[PDB]
Amino acid sequence: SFTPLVVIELAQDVKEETKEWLKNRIIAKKKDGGAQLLFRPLLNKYEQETLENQNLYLVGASKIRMLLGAEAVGLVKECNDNTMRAFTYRTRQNFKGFDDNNDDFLTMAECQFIIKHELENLRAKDEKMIPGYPQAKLYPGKSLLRRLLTSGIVIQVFPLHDSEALKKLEDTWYTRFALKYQPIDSIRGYFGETIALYFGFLEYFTFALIPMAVIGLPYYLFVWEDYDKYVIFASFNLIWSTVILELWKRGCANMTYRWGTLLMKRKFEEPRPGFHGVLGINSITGKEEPLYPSYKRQLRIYLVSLPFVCLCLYFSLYVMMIYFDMEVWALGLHENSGSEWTSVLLYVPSIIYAIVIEIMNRLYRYAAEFLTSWENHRLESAYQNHLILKVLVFNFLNCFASLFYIAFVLKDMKLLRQSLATLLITSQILNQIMESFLPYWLQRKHGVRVKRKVQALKADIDATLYEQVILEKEMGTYLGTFDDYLELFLQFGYVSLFSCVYPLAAAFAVLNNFTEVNSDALKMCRVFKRPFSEPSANIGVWQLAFETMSVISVVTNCALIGMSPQVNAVFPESKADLILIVVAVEHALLALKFILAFAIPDKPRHIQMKLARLEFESLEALKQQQM
Template sequence: MEGFGGANLKVLPIPDTAPFTPLVVIELAEDTNEEAIAWLISRIKDKQHHGGAELMVDRLILDQNSKENHNIFIVGASRERLLVGAEDVGLVKEFSDGSMRSFTYANRHNFKNFLGDGDGFLSMVECQFIVKHELDILRARGETHVPGYPKIRLYPGKSIVRRIQSKGILVQIFPLHDKEELKRLSSTWYQNVRLSFQPLDDIRHYFGESLALYFGFLEYFTLAMVPMAFIGIPYYLFDWEDYDKYVLFAVFNLVWSTVFLEMWKRCSASLAYSWGTLSRKKAFEEPRPGFHGVLGINPVTGRQEPVYPYAKRQLRIYLVSVPFVLLCLYLSTCVMMVYFSAENWVLGLHDEEPTFWTSLLLYVPSIIYAVVIEIMNRIYRYVAEFLTNWENHRLESTYQNHLTLKVLVFNFLNCFASLFYIAFVMQDMPLLRQSLATLLITSQILNQFVEAFLPFWLQKRRNKHLHRKSGLASVDQELPFNQQVMLEANMSTYLGTFDDYLELFLLFGYVSLFSCVYPLAALLAVLNNITEVYSDALKMCRVFKRPFSEPAADIGVWQLAFESMSIMAVVTNCALIGMSPQMKSYFPDSETQLILLVVAVEHILLAFKFILTFVIPDIPKHIQIKLARLEFESMEALKKKKMLEAAAIQNKGQ
């Protein structure tokens, strides 16, 4: 079985079963009852028609004197079991005619690249996704509680893994890295610094579609900002005091942001189609592991499961979460006002006695405020997660939507409120330019340090410690399999693309909202994104555990967030241009005429944005045709099946 899915991992011997390729690691709590362990392992190994997952599992062998947790298990599956699982999860693969179709085990030989018995047909990341899915849908049958834990109830038909995870028996589940494949990916991705496109197909093959789409968006965003950066440089160097000359630059920026986002939709649709996720049917969503409530009946499935009153959740949201978020926004505003007080004090000090040191001191309040913003954003993130957990949302998608809304509102106010205040209340354009530059540069440096270099340094120390403990002279030497598993078990867990998209969202705001004041922002963003590609690739390959693949057809709610920001950019840039002294000089006697002109231009630009959105289709024409043809063939096949069934019934009656 070695080599299935491209894996080069060691094959573990299992008593009374065939050897298998290790795919997934299950870590149970160190004090887990042996009766519960035996029950869980038997359920994982049991046949499907008996209610089991029909997977292969064995305990990781560690030194008896080791202080490490000994309740660590390696899970794999036979080739046939994985192929059947591929059909269960709705995996889409390339058919022999070149179209993308849902895989079926019975029709497996008609799929492209299915050679012989199918060895290598599924990638390792697909195999790991299938194993995780089979573990997640392992359901309670007649058990009323977890063996050895009479207080932990089990609900018939509900996921066992999610239940024991929410109760702390299950510590973690994670997929194993493939060292050889990871080395190949690293060499073509981040180890050699060069100007080239990212290997998105290889990233998808190793990490799955969700991460590949993130890196695809990061690359597309970076390339799209290159023209903005080149155009912004001469504006910044030669015309930065004449704001009326920024009208063309601002209009170009607004058109650019619309075209960029619409063209990205087409690009992501092409990628998703080639990866088989564009036409993939969404699976029925299971409740979150942390969801709790009294036992009731699910009206959709008819199964017994915990239920939680909708009204109670709404009360928690509107009587606790919303007021608390508003309080956080108020505190953020107070911090902003303290920053302005410090800024005024420093300006006054410099005006009284201008020296080299006081000129340097002018930047100190902005730098300190930028650091405080980053700290507040991170603290608030934990508060938002706690509140969203406490609201007790049933589905993971609902949980993510509420969390995203909370975090976006706070981060937007925290990062941009001071800039709006300087622009529209103080109307101090030089200070706006200085503050924007300071916030942009400081946040980029802090993000790179906290998100990439610090975790990498800590992980490198852990690696050295483990290699010394194993008696190896160099970190380049390969660890024994059991030590490699322990190394990965102690790695940081990747929490998803949320923070990565949030960082790009704020960067997009800095570039688009105030483009007519600081056109150099696009250049700084390009430089940041280039380093972001390498730092994010480094942490995915060297710092974090390998995440499970998440099928995705687009960037989800973040597309809407970026589009909303681009609409706000129209309003902001039009207002800034209208407030410039040069524009006001054209209307010395009537400020009302200037306001009406600005509003009219704003509406024209918004209309132009929506026309562009309508004109540019989200999915390329050739992909629309392929999807329509596949749907037509499915309908024809269904009609044929019904006709055959009707003919069979008629013949039976005769």
């Protein structure tokens, strides 16, 4: 009669012996080699109509069980003396807002995180195989849930949405008529810390292009390129990108200390789901793990994947060259035909090119995910770095090659303004359609169909739970916060790479992000399943990617300074000093940008003092056991 927290969906053709063996490994206590979780079927009775939903099981636990699981995970809660310490069951009375009759201490995100973590740490010791299935090779030290997922018995494990606390989050989230700081702490308590860091980063990055847009809106309209001759605005833009990328690191440390995930120790990562080698003794841990020879992994990268990426980049350049012949053909068609179709025909080939870019990027994303899931990467952190490298290089190249080809080969700034504005707005509109609005529309149709099916059932089913579980079974799963950072990287690419010749593009990012804060929120609320809460202390490798964009943008902006007609009027006869002065401005901005990233400290002032006290308190505890 408990509250369901995690849903396990078994497959159809599952024998009874495996069901009872799994049920006996869940309910049995922690000292008997079980997991001590409360288990329940979805329905106590069944009729011939609902027999195809007879495999859904709910997993929860009791309060003392969640506290013992909180000791095992290492949740970081606030103490009564305003200090973030690791949670232990023996010292549980010290923490703020805690009673022994308080079910509101551990939030639903941490409770769902602990139950997924206890199913992950469910290992086999005596059993060499799963009873009833030959191919389930079980060695001692292998997770049970991982082998059930890879062998196709457990289809999906997903946490449950809370339909009455989600609406109270949505009431204070969708900003639409008034500027308002987004409630990142309530987002955190509902969605974990990784999803909250992205929404904190999106809310931060929106309030960092407002100086670019406010300065750059009259800088393009009133043409102030006569007075400063492009030196103040280019210098202001590039120094400003470094300042927001350093103040984001300060703000991210401050936020992630307020939640506690700055102090969680690095948990040792198990091999990822889909890493197969030969069974052997792991050298590091001393346990039994799959082993793979390192030379086969290095060969599969640097001889198959890297040539395939190079072929795809060459193929991306080939599609770019096709587009420019289409542009010349359309310009000739504009010279041929008339007066009426003289402005609408000029916007058509960039739109066709924009749609082809956003189709080829998703096609390249599936091929690169497959080609990196084929290389048998061991950890999950390593797999993410290689996938990020392949997809980032191609998306950088495929989106900005055409703008680079216009600016530095044709050298035609009127065509560059038109093409940059059209590419940015069309890619964003097509992004907002394929990311959130069209999947939300398909979900409304699918939700209405399941609801109209459930109200016509003629059974005594408690509908308030079964309808909810059936709806969240067929939702789409969240594939990490990787695409949601990639959209911001390409927006930051379109704004900052060519902010000299077209600063107005900065405004076209801000008017997008005022929707994106809404649109992504809808994508997490009514589109996808609830993602499992995952602790993260920073955005990760994306800090290096955004900073690399701000260094590349120095070279690109300085190359656009040395081609404008304003600066070439300064040195009409001596074109050998213009390049030297532009290179001096380029090296001075690069040196000043790296000094700014090196001068500003990474952690803030008072957070560094609180982290220093927590280290000194832990060092004295070791000293006290010695003393």
